Design a protein around this nucleic acid. Sequence first.
RNA 1: AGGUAA
Length: 29
Amino acid sequence: NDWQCKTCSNVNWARRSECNMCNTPKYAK
RNA sequence: AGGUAA
Ligand SMILES: [Zn+2]
């Protein structure tokens, strides 16, 4: 369930609700 | 839990 950030392409651990690197929320699309 | 290698 890891997820890729639309904004910076970082692959975020499933448990994160915001990107680890750029802080963009998972729902921000 | 675990972060840059994904
Ligand atoms: Zn990001």
